[PDB]
Structure formats: structure tokens, C-alpha cells
């Protein structure tokens, strides 16, 4: 019911021996993948440059059964020419510095953010300003690029996640919402008008008492804020969407209408009134990383950090623990659910990269460290409370 | 609890009419007269006595307010007159008279609204005098403005039409919708004023919860099977100009919501399947079955009349619907038997009433004691510093 | 083990061609059989009059191999004369208007209820008052007929199911409990004294949340209440029984002593107190229509509406999902299980009628819409939790 | 028994006229005082440079009856020569740029931080790095100045509040804990060893839901973190104390042992484990700004933002809303309670500066906008739950 599509002991690249032979050109233990998203039998895998020796930040892998496809070599997408790191480390609009979590739209486009920053522990290296890209997946050619101005974000240290707001009819009318978990802000991107602005709000912060974890016997505390945003279907009478959002270090989910997010003058305010609202409590130890809203079912899928699992929730039901169900659980293989994503084919995709092991312990290249699963949404929710045909619980 | 006023209190209900009615056999009986409502308008309070038994001289009545409070055993005056409240001996349809009226509501445009059930519910003998009909009363001149008889296609008798909720336009006042809660046939009848047309909704959520219908007030155990009872409307949505209808059955610990866009739609009412248009809001709490509730337009707070807990609770509609986001603002085990009504006036006050119906129905009703009570409390002042205050943040689990 | 016995593409009757050649004396799409019960190689199939063009409300079919017998012709039972529809529509004591679910007891009698009411879309027509019948099965001769007074139930709108309580010794001492899913009541009938009284309770109602269904990709919601009752074996000392009852729109099962049900004085109360009991929660999407109690094994068989299945439960074991087992499942054929009956031979019987296809989509007469099955109880519960010799999964 | 000591309509400075006439030298509305602290009949008032037109950032007022002293002219302290803002805006270790909340110890010293930064809306101007001063209050001469290195804090943007940990025996052995409400950190200053380090922790952050205010009908939200720290009496043997700390936008109070704060190695951990403990919940709408510990009684006083009030708590009684009492409430005058200090004479001192009227509304210089109050601690707690002899209301 949940199949493991991809797994790695370590990450390897399809680049010239020139790059592999050069000193500190490729360090295996340094290459931690951060996302894997799906598009027509192709899975895009990112390796953010938090370390030296990372040949390509954006990558692709071709799918062929049977699964799991073991240790697939990553090919620098769209071309190694872009994923090359300049030796002079200077700004370049035709180079990809660091990419985290891309998303695929219905228009055969790949959207991502090049942070332009390398978070090497010891030497944080700001190469260039953060940029929003779109790639045509039919032609494998870059379409648009937008550099995010200083007035919205200073560096791009925390721009690790994005949510796409594409009009159902016009494929050109696109907004993008970026979650900054480091500076506790959300950056809205008007693609159509090549404009952007930023929101600041108390709800983008962590909950002081809810940033403590114990995973695989390792304890740690994080202060990471707004991390994921999930958009409902456009309202029939208003055309706007509910933005479900949460901090990494929180057991709470909050909501805001896109009408607020799409409005620049609203961002510039000192006080947002009661535009941003609390949806409610997700449960004990129910801190989530990435969550996604499946349009056809109206079901939100949560990646649960502490519980080493993936849960779901039907949006029509009241937001309550007894109205959510765990669809998958794996204490051995889910160490940190780094990414969750919903494809154009009715599947929920999720990924674990064992980052906690690396950070706080020793990762072992003998074992399989990085995993990618998939599940058919309609099939996975059938019996459960996440099924729209199943009534909510009495509590 | 220590800033809520007991405005009116009776031991019995007496009337102001010609002595020919009062002296005639079975024209008036002490125990048979029970008011189901207390409503406030500009220093005069409308009280109604529905005809559950014989000897009810008048149904819809009015009382003038004068300190000290509580005003003890006031003499009820038939409103708008006695000549619309006079029971016919022939019992034919009186298109200009009032048989049984339950809970009226006061809108912003100085009007009173109520339903003429046209049906008397005497134990042993049920009598359908006339068809159900709704009124509008000019409270300035005391003159009836409109009457509308509801077609058989919507309600058969008017047996359970014991509750009304008003949906008046913010700007215009000719555009008025009404939502009547039928707790007996388990339905909601909607009325379109400007068009003078009415239709009805049937739904599973209008029924009681089989397990949550058992009560025990004053050591008297009983169970009722009554359905949809009260509806409360949020302020119009700035983007859609529609409202959220909050509704619960009498015998339920659950609250449900529905957009007024659905309720105001005739073609939607004739569907056999309403989809996900009606939704569960959530659980009110253990032993939190509510009779009547109201939405305060200014604060955005719903006040619940709690049946089992002998209390009035509040909830800020901005906060998630959960017991820890609710507070009891008034509680009276000795004086509150059955909170039969709750209404919000135009002056920012919560008006709630207990009529001791349980003791009459299942026990002894003594006229030596006080059996009827009307209360009022300042909303902005009673919620200040509680979870119900919009400026106070919501609560969380751990 | 579980076998299909009778299945129809459509239903036709063995009646004069005069009724069949009348202006709409038979419309094929309007005839939906609601029940099928067993007695010594005979099966009674009922077509309640919910539309126009139905010749016979009560019928009979003969069991003759091979199974499943294809498109059997329905023979009006006991006769056509009684099953005939009066064009004058006047109350008639020796006729039959609408019959739902008959039952068969240990004293060779067939028992049913004629509602006397025809629920046609546009015009609901009450022809006569509801009537309970006995039929001597050996002779085919109507034994008794009691008309239910206005004091107990007004219309017979929802008297679609009955459950028989026969004394284990004397056949004259019979109590019949009728389920009313429309007005939310249980009508109790004393066969000897020829009296009756009704019960009203909160537990006969639907559960507001648990009344939505999606069968064959078709969403719908019903407000249907108390639908089926199952009577246990008389307690060896008190000689009373436990009546298990559920609403159609409920996942909950409830229990009541037969001492309370057989008591007229208790029937006129306003508050029954602690008498009616909740047994528990059957499970997610475990709403059931008609269920029966097998006396020999002490096992209840449920017909599950949403799960498209038939399940069982050993009454000795505590009521819990883990202590229950699904004995048959058919997502293709079982759309809505309309009847479940237990014959005198130790078999469980269940039927599907494709009713929701008629109501919300269109019915195809070129496909088999109506199905009846039989299962041997002792063989079917053998390797399951329902076996009285096997221990429970949960001690509760 | 709570008496108002000082009040201003507007703040004025005793300074050469050439400074007052200079272009944007003195803008009355910009001069919002932020602290008033008592030492031997002298109250030190600060005006942090968050706007242009502030002649002097640290000032002194000489207390004399009758109270309240209306519109006292602020005298620059120690002198105007240190307080005067350099036009060229270059760094200078002999200049005071921005001082928020000074504190007086037992050793006749005035301790404060010059943030070195001007938080002017539109252009924040970092003139110099933040520094920590001590001034001998007997001679009015500065005793020491220490620049906080860039490893510990970035700019001094949020170094608006300090707490003294003075050795009960030795005056030369001091630690100062500084709260950074902007970057959510604590800076620890080792006075004897002229060293410093920082602590980062989740508990220094605001609580997302508890940062919404409405004072005087003015709705606003702040994201302000760790604001105040209050130290218990030292352990007789080890001399370690309990540090009571809270964020501005939080209803929760936390504790940590000074054993931890005074440990440079502990501050370099990525994970602090169980060292920082949640003490508990202060009550609905009980967001505190500044609080203080009074050694003689063991009572902590809180300045309450939303409640326009000062509350207290006996540290011996469990930390719970009912174990706390409001000792002073003034909705008219207390608008933003900007400071609370505990002097060497058993008094509690508190201040309201109406900052929120300047920020989100308008300030009228005809009204008294800045107020300073004092109260005798033992007299103010006599009857209340805060009295050490009175029993707790809850065991918790
Ligand atoms: C885009 O957003 C801007 C303001 O942000 C919000 O707008 C709406 C979503 C509302 O929820 C509002 O409360 C919130 O501030 C704004 O440019 C624009 O419309 C706002 O709508 C306000 C209410 O109608 C209105 O406020 C007006 O001005 C203020 C300063 C006062 O004088 C008020 O008395 C007066 O009503 C104003 O048009 C504007 N708000 C502001 C602050 O300028 C909104 N546009 C959309 C949604 O299309
Ligand atoms: C101050 O800082 C160190 C970390 O704090 C604690 O360390 C544990 C002992 C425990 O109390 C935890 O709650 C917390 O993490 C602490 O270890 C240190 O003690 C010294 O630590 C040095 C390195 O960690 C080491 O050289 C010594 O062995 C240890 N000294 C001992 C245990 O006597 C604390 N005290 C200092 C530096 O004086
Ligand atoms: C910050 O990183 C510096 C960069 O040095 C190199 O950068 C890349 C080109 C890679 O090849 C990488 O592997 C190299 O380290 C480091 O200098 C420095 O760490 C140490 O520096 C000394 C002196 O150069 C060197 O001998 C040692 O091996 C280390 O690399 C690092 N500084 C900090 C504080 O993290
Ligand atoms: C009453 O409810 C109807 C539900 O059938 C609404 O119909 C909807 O309207 C759209 C556009 O006209 C159709 O595509 C579709 O029939 C849909 O269900 C109808 O609008 C509504 N009436 C009013 C006045 O709101
Ligand atoms: Ca961080
Ligand atoms: Ca009822
Ligand atoms: Ca029905
Ligand atoms: Ca801040």
C-alpha cells in the first residue's frame, strides 16, 4: 500500500571524473539529499550545499520498476553547466548555488528557489541573492527567473520551502509562497507582475515548549519556524484559497486566506488584525515538517517528525487528533521526514534523509540512509477517518 | 454570576382582560399558563404563553419595565391587543387572531417577529385550529405589518415550530429571511419575506443524538427526543455577504454549521441529498446539551443556554470550537430548572429565561415558590477577561 | 459454502394476461423485491407497492436445482385474489396491499405485515390500516389476521420488518415485535389476547453522523430508524430473552429485556429509565440493515450496508469489532442487503435488490439486479471467532 | 500607599541653548523616557535614542517634596560631556549613545548598557558596539566600561534590560545577565574576568498566541522575547541563585540556575538539556514586561502590560494565578508599564511612558504621559496572598 520507490546508502553524480578527482570536489558523507519530487516517471532530487564537495545541487533520476531502485546515480538537472559552482564564488544568474524543495505544477513546470547561500558550519557563504525559477519539463529548458530584492529577505538563509498558487484556468497567473523557517517570515511572489513582498507575523514563530525532540534515542531542540504551507481548493464564490500553515517546532496549525497573501498593501502593515487565525491542536508530539493538500480528496497529508510517520486529515472534518489517522509509520527508516509532496497523478510522496544521525551522531555509508516512498491517496484513505465518505469521530 | 440581573420573577401568571373571560369556567387556570419566552424592547418586555393546556386567555403578551428588580408577579397585557389573542369557542381559522406563539425575536428595524403555530398541544387532545403563519409587528405603532401562512408543502401542522431566527439585511430592511426550527418533525423551514415565499430543508443533522438525550434536573430523570431547536447567525461575510448558521438539536452535545447561501436557496432545499453543505462544527462538552443560543453581532460571541448544567455558557466564534474555549458566565442550580429561552437585544444584553417546565411535567409545581425567572446581563462586561473575550487568546490542550 | 440460489434480471408474475395487458398493470422497472425467506424448498419473495404496476405484493418460488435459478416467475401467495389491487382502492379485509419482510417460525406458520399503504412518488396513498398475518404453511390457509389500532401506530408507513417470539413449548403463545424505521417506534403484538401496544425511545432514532452512504460510487443519506430486532434464547430460569436492536443509520447495537417489551403498562410510560441498554459500537462503516439470531449456536448474523457484506457475532463473547468476523463479501453483487433471515434448518439467508441504483441512477434490466444467497451456519463460523468453542480475541 | 513620585507632560533637559537650537537638536515628542531608578533620593531617568532630537540619553532627577514632582528638568548624568551625541556619528568609548534600563546594586554603583545603536524608524543607525558601564554613585565617576565582542551579540539592538548578580560578600565579584528581546538571547557578563558569552534557547522566544495586546483601545502585536530576569537569594554554601525569566509576549515564567548562566562552556552547547525549566503559567492576559525579586521578603513583583497593573508573587508559594495578587491597578495612567525596579530601601518602583500612544496613535503634550510610582514592599504585601505569613490559596 506504501511502496519504497528510491533508497541510497550514499549519493553519487553523473559528472566528469575531472570533478570527482579534484580535491574536495566530492565528499560522500557531505551529500545529504533534501527533497525528491515526482513528474512522469522522473524524480528530482536536491542536495543543498550545507557542506563542501557537493557537485550538483539540483538533480534528476529516471524511474524503472521494480522498486526500490537502489542507489540511482543523480544527473545534474537541467545541466551540470548550471549546477557548477564558480571557483571565484561570484554572483551569476546562470548558476544554481543551493536548492531545497522544488514543486511541480499542473503546467509541466518545475518551480524552485536558489537560496544563493551555502550554510557550511564554520563559514556561512553568501554567494548571491535568492532567486525563484521555473523550468519547462517538456523541453528541459529554464523559463523564468526572479531575484528576490533585499526589501523582502536579507539573504535566503531560510528559504527552504515553497507552495504554488496556480489559477485553474490561466496557466500564466501564478503566485508562490515561500516559508522562511530561519527569520520567521513568508515571502509572496507575484510571478505575473514580477513583484514580491514579505509577511511578518507572531504565528510564524515556533512554540517555545514544542521544539524539543527525541529521535532514534537522540535528543535535540530546534527553533525552526514557519516551514510548510498547504492551499485548499479555490472557493466557488470567491476564487480564493485557505492557506494551512505551521511552524516546524509547533503542535499547532494556522490558516490565512490567499486574498490576504496576494495583497501587497496587507503585507506592509504593522498589524494584521485577525486575518491570521488558529485552526487548532494537532496532538501530543505531533510536530510536522512538510504537509500537502490533495485537491481531488480535500485531504491534508502531514509528515510527522517525532512520531516517525505520515498522517492525514480530511479538511471537511473538525481539526482534531481523533479526526486524523496515521497512514504510514516506520521507526527504522523514517529518521527525519525531510519532504512531502503531492504529484499530478494522485499519489503522496515522502522522504527521509536521516539528517539527525548526521548532525548529532555518525551516519553509516554501509546502511541505507536516504529513503523515498509513495502511496496512492484514494487507496490509502479508504478505510480511515481521512476518507470523505467516513463521518468524523464523536470525541 | 455576580453581575447578572434577575429582572422578572413569578409564582403564577395573571392577565389584564375583561372579567367575563377570567370568571368563566376554564377560561383561566393557575397551573396551565406557562410562558416560553422573555424578549426585550425599549423598556417593555414581551412574554408569551403557548397553549399546552386549556384556560390560556392570551398567547403573545407585553410587560412594561419599572424598578426595583425583580418586578414580582407582573400583570401580563395581551399584545398587540386582546382581540387578536382571544380564543374562539368555535375554533375555526382566525386569519386575524393568534392561537399559539412560542419564541419571538426583536430585529433592528423596530419590528417583532413570531410564528402562529395555529395548533394547541393539550395532553390527550391535540387541536389544529389553523395553519402555521408568521407575523411582522411595527413596535412603534403596535400595528401588524404582514402575515404569511406557510403552505402544507413545507410544514404539516406547526407542531414543532417553537423557535425563530432572523436574517435581516444590513443596509436595506425590505429584504428579510427567517429560519424556523422544527424540533418535532425534524426540519428547518426558511421564509423569504420580500418575495412572500417559503420552502423547507430536511437533513440527518436536524435529529437528536440517541445517547445524548437523557437529562436529570432537580433529581428528576427524563429523556426528550427533540431535534433542531436553535439557530444562530454570524455577521455577514465581507467578501460573500452571506452568514454562518450555527445550529444544534436539543438532545445533542454537538454543534453543526451551514452557510446561509444554502438556506436562502429554494432549489437546494428540494434536493434529496445536500452533500457537504451542512457540516459538524464539533463537541460542546460532556453534559452540554443546549436549548436556545444566540450570536452577538458586536463581540462575535455565542451564548448557550445549557440544559443539563443549569447554566449559561459563552463561546467566541473566532476561537476553535472546543470545551476549553468555552466558559460558564452564569450558573444557578436552585433557580434554573429549564432554560427555555435565550435572546440578544439591540442594547448589547443577553436575556435568558427559566420556566420550571420539568417540575410541572414530571413532578409538582407549587405556586407558593417562584417558578418563573427572567435574567439580563451586559455582554461586553460579562465576557471581559474570559476566554469569550475576543481580545483574549484561545486555549490549547497540554 | 455460500451459494447464490435465486437471481433476477427483472421480475415477472404468474398472473392472467388481462392484468399484464391492462393500461400499466405491470411496469418492469417499478418492481423491486424486498425480501426472500425459506421454508422446505420454498422461498417467499415480496414486492411492496412503492410504485404503480405491481400485481402481487406477496409471492412464492420453488427451489429446484441447478442453482442459481435464473429469472424465476413469481407465483402470488397464497392466491392472486388476495394479492390483487382494487381499482376502487377501498379498505378490504381479505386483500393484500403492501408486504415487506415476512418471517417463518417453528410451528409451520408464515408471519408478515401488510402496511396497507402505497408510497408512490407524488401521491402517498393509505388504502387500509396495517395488518399482521399468520399463514399455515402446510395448508396455505390464512390462520389469523389482526388489524393494528390507531392508538399504536397511525399509518404503517415504516412497518417494514418483524421479529417473532414463540414460546418453546406452546405454539399459541406468540409475541411479535414490529420495527418502525419511519416514525421511530416498536409495535408489540400479543397473539393470544389479540391486543397491542407501542414503545417510543431515544434509541430507536438514527445517529445524525452515521447515516451517509456510498455504495457503487453513489452518495446518499437516509434518516431511517429502528430496522431489525434479534431475540436470544430464553434465559433458562426467567424464561425471558434479550432483544438486540439497531437503527439502519447507526453503528450502535442496543439490548432490551423481553420482559419490558411484553409489558403493556411499561409501554404507556413517558420515561423507561435504565431499561433500554446500549450494547456497544459495531465498528466503522458497520451500519446494518437486517440481522438475525441463530438459536442453536447463539450467533447473530448482520447484513452490513456500507461494507457490502454479511458478518457474524457470538453473543457469549463481549461485543467488539475484534470478536466479530465477516463471513461473506461481494462488492459486485451485494449493493444494498435488504433482508436477512434464518430458516428452520440452520441456514442464514440474505438478499440484494439494487434499490439505490433505481433511486439515484437508472436500473439496467439487462443485468442481474436481484440476488438471494444461503449459507450453512455451522460450516461458515467454523474457522472463525464466531465459533462458540473458539475463545474471544478480546476479553474487553 | 502607592505614591506617584514623578510625572511629565514632556521631558526637558538642562543643556546649553546652542544644543536646543541646533537643527533637530530637541524634538519634544521624540523624547520618551524608558526607566526611572532610585538611589538615595536621586532618580535616574533614561531616554533611549530611538528617534532624532534627544539631547541626552542618561539623566538624573533630584527628589524633593511635595510629590508628585511635576515636570522636573532632566540633568544629564554623569555629565552632558558623555551624553552628548556626536554629530559625525563616529564610535567613541567616552560617549553614551543609547541607554534603556539602569540598575543600582548594594555597592553604590549604577550599572547599565549603552546599546550603541539608534533605532530610528526608516534608518537604524549603529554608532558603536554595545558596552557595559558601572558608575560610582558616591563620586559620580565611571568605574568601568566593557565592550561586548561581536561573538556574543551582533549590534545591541535588543540589549534593553540587565540583571545584577553581585557576590553577597565581595563587591568586586559581579555577573550581569542581559536580556536580548530582539535576537532572543541572553548575554552573560563576567565583571571580574572581563569576559562574556551568550545563551541561545527556545524559551527566550515569544509564545505565538500570547503576543496580542489591546491597551487603551489600541490593538497591537509584538514579537518580543526574553525581557526580564529576576534573581532569588543565593544558596548559602555555593552562592548560586534561581533566575526567573520571561518573554514579553508570553504568559509563562521560566527558571534556570545561575550555575548554568555563569558557565561559559555550558553556553557553547547546541543542546541545553533540562537546565532551563518551565516554571508555569502566570494567568490570562498576564504578559509581564519587567519584574523584580525583593531579597528581604522573597516576593517577586511583575509589571503587567495588558492589565495596566503591578502584581506580586511569593516564591515560596507554588507559581499559580490565585497565588498572585494585584497590588496596584491604574487603567487611566498605566498605559505601557515600561520599567520596574527594586531599590536598596525596600521599595518597588514602576513606570509608565505611554509608548503605544506615540507609536500607534498620538501623544498630546498637554496630558501627563510619563509617570513614576513607588511603594513600600512590606506594607504593600501585608494583607495579601503575597505576605510570607499568609497561607497559599492553592497547592498546585
Ligand atoms: C488590501 O489590503 C490592504 C489592507 O489590508 C487589509 O485589507 C483587507 C483584506 C481588510 O481585511 C483590512 O482590514 C486589512 O487592513 C488595503 O490596501 C486594501 O483594503 C483595505 O480595506 C480596509 C477596510 O475596507 C480600508 O480601511 C480604510 O483605511 C483605514 C486606514 C481607515 O481609515 C479605515 O477607516 C478605512 O476603512 C482600506 O481600504 C484598506 N486598508 C488600509 C489599511 O489601507 C486591501 N484590498 C483588497 C482586499 O482588495
Ligand atoms: C559547566 O559546563 C559543562 C556543561 O554543563 C553540564 O555538564 C554536565 C556535567 C551536566 O551538569 C549537564 O547538566 C550540563 O550539560 C560541564 O560539563 C562543566 O563541568 C565540566 O565539564 C567539562 C567539559 O564538559 C569537563 O572538563 C569536566 O569534566 C566537567 N567537570 C566536572 C564534571 O567536574 C561545567 N562546569 C565547569 C566548567 O566548571
Ligand atoms: C572555513 O573553510 C575554509 C576553506 O578551506 C577550503 O575550502 C574549500 C575550497 C574546500 O576545499 C575545503 O575542504 C577547504 O577546507 C577552511 O580553511 C577552514 O577550515 C580549516 O582551515 C585551515 C586553514 O586553511 C585548513 O588547514 C584546515 O584543513 C581546515 O579546512 C574553515 N574555517 C572554519 C572556522 O570552519
Ligand atoms: C442553488 O443551488 C444550486 C445547486 O444545484 C446552484 O447551482 C449551481 O450553480 C452553478 C452555476 O449556475 C451550476 O454549474 C450548478 O448547477 C451548481 O450546482 C445555484 O446556483 C443555487 N442558487 C443560487 C441563487 O445561489
Ligand atoms: Ca534556526
Ligand atoms: Ca419530541
Ligand atoms: Ca424517512
Ligand atoms: Ca522585536
Amino acid at each position: 500500500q506504501v511502496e519504497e520507490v528510491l533508497k541510497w546508502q550514499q549519493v553519487e553524480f553523473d559528472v566528469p571524473a575531472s570533478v570527482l578527482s579534484a580535491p574536495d570536489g566530492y565528499i560522500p558523507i557531505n551529500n545529504i539529499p533534501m527533497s525528491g519530487v515526482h513528474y512522469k516517471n522522473r524524480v528530482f532530487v536536491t542536495v543543498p550545499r550545507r557542506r563542501w564537495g557537493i557537485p550538483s545541487t539540483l538533480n534528476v533520476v529516471e524511474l524503472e520498476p521494480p522498486y526500490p531502485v537502489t542507489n540511482p546515480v543523480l544527473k545534474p538537472y537541467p545541466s551540470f553547466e548550471l549546477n557548477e559552482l564558480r571557483a571565484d564564488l561570484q554572483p551569476d544568474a546562470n548558476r544554481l548555488v543551493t536548492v531545497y524543495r522544488p514543486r511541480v505544477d499542473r503546467c509541466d513546470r518545475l518551480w524552485f528557489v536558489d537560496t544563493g547561500m551555502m550554510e557550511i558550519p564554520g563559514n556561512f557563504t553568501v554567494v548571491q541573492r535568492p532567486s525563484i525559477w521555473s523550468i519547462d519539463l517538456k523541453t528541459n529548458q529554464p523559463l523564468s527567473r526572479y531575484e528576490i530584492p533585499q526589501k523582502d529577505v536579507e539573504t535566503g538563509y531560510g528559504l527552504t520551502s515553497i507552495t504554488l498558487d496556480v489559477d485553474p484556468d490561466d496557466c500564466s497567473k501564478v503566485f508562490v509562497y515561500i516559508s522562511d523557517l530561519q527569520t520567521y517570515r513568508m515571502v509572496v511572489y507575484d510571478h505575473e507582475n514580477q513583484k514580491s513582498w514579505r509577511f511578518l507575523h507572531n504565528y510564524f514563530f515556533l512554540n517555545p515548549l514544542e521544539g524539543d525532540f527525541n529521535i532514534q534515542g537522540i535528543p535535540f531542540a530546534w527553533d525552526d519556524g514557519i516551514f510548510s504551507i498547504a492551499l485548499s481548493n479555490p472557493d466557488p464564490m470567491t476564487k480564493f484559497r485557505t492557506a494551512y500553515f505551521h511552524a516546524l517546532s509547533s503542535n499547532s496549525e494556522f490558516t490565512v486566506s490567499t486574498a490576504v497573501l496576494r495583497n501587497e498593501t496587507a503585507s506592509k502593515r504593522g498589524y494584521h488584525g485577525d486575518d491570521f487565525k488558529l485552526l487548532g491542536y494537532r496532538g501530543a508530539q505531533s510536530q510536522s515538517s512538510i504537509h500537502g493538500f490533495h485537491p481531488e480528496t480535500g485531504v491534508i497529508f502531514f509528515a510527522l517528525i517525532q512520531l516517525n510517520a505520515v498522517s492525514c486529515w480530511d479538511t471537511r472534518k473538525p481539526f482534531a487528533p481523533q479526526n486524523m489517522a496515521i497512514v504510514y509509520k516506520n521507526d527504522r527508516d523514517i529518521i527525519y521526514p525531510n519532504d512531502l509532496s503531492i504529484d499530478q497523478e494522485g499519489n503522496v510522496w515522502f522522504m527521509s534523509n536521516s539528517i539527525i544521525k548526521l548532525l548529532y551522531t555518525q551516519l553509516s555509508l554501509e546502511e541505507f540512509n536516504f529513503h523515498i516512498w509513495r502511496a496512492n491517496i484514494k487507496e490509502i484513505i479508504k478505510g480511515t477517518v481521512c476518507d470523505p465518505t467516513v463521518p468524523p469521530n464523536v470525541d
Side-chain angles (χ1 to χ4, degrees), chain A residues 229-274:
Chain A
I229 309 170
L231 304 169
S232 68
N233 293 323
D235 188 63
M237 358 191 44
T238 328
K239 306 290 171 188
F240 289 118
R241 301 157 79 114
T242 297
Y244 297 94
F245 71 95
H246 62 76
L248 187 158
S249 293
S250 184
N251 294 322
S252 299
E253 193 77 22
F254 301 83
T255 66
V256 65
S257 179
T258 53
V260 185
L261 300 185
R262 287 150 54 90
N263 173 345
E264 178 167 4
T265 310
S267 83
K268 280 176 154 76
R269 300 176 292 171
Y271 179 71
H272 304 269
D274 59 319

Side-chain angles (χ1 to χ4, degrees), chain A residues 150-279:
Chain A
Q150 291 84 316
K151 62 172 173 66
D152 301 331
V153 145
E154 197 70 8
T155 60
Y157 170 37
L159 311 187
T160 57
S161 162
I162 50 108
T163 310
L164 306 174
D165 199 1
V166 181
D167 186 278
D169 298 293
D170 193 0
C171 174
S172 200
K173 291 169 177 287
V174 180
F175 273 92
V176 179
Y177 314 116
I178 315 160
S179 306
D180 188 328
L181 56 74
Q182 300 288 12
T183 71
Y184 311 98
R185 71 180 64 188
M186 188 208 292
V187 184
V188 181
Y189 166 57
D190 198 338
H191 174 65
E192 189 185 338
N193 298 54
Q194 292 291 84
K195 287 195 180 78
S196 61
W197 49 91
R198 67 91 182 100
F199 275 91
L200 297 169
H201 198 285
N202 278 2
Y203 299 168
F204 299 161
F205 284 96
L206 72 146
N207 194 310
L209 307 168
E210 308 189 314
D212 282 71
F213 301 95
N214 196 322
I215 286 148
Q216 217 76 64
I218 310 155
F220 63 95
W222 291 345
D223 63 17
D224 292 342
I226 186 164
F227 191 26
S228 193
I229 309 170
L231 304 169
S232 68
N233 293 323
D235 188 63
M237 358 191 44
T238 328
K239 306 290 171 188
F240 289 118
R241 301 157 79 114
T242 297
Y244 297 94
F245 71 95
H246 62 76
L248 187 158
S249 293
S250 184
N251 294 322
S252 299
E253 193 77 22
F254 301 83
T255 66
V256 65
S257 179
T258 53
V260 185
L261 300 185
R262 287 150 54 90
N263 173 345
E264 178 167 4
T265 310
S267 83
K268 280 176 154 76
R269 300 176 292 171
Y271 179 71
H272 304 269
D274 59 319
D275 287 343
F276 292 77
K277 300 305 274 189
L278 168 72
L279 187 69

